């Protein structure tokens, strides 16, 4: 399936979080996207902007 080494979650959802200029603000990302159904939206949120 969807294999951590860049797939279209990783590489669209993993990728923008990280080419975008930020990680994980500690090891959530990892669960974070699962929880997230692998997506940056809520992602971002967790990573610097947990204030909107």
Known sequence: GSPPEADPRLIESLSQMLSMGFSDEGGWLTR?????????????????????
């Open 32 to 52: 974070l996207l699962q929880t997230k159904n692998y997506d940056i939206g809520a992602a971002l949120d967790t990573i610097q902007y947990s204030k909107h």
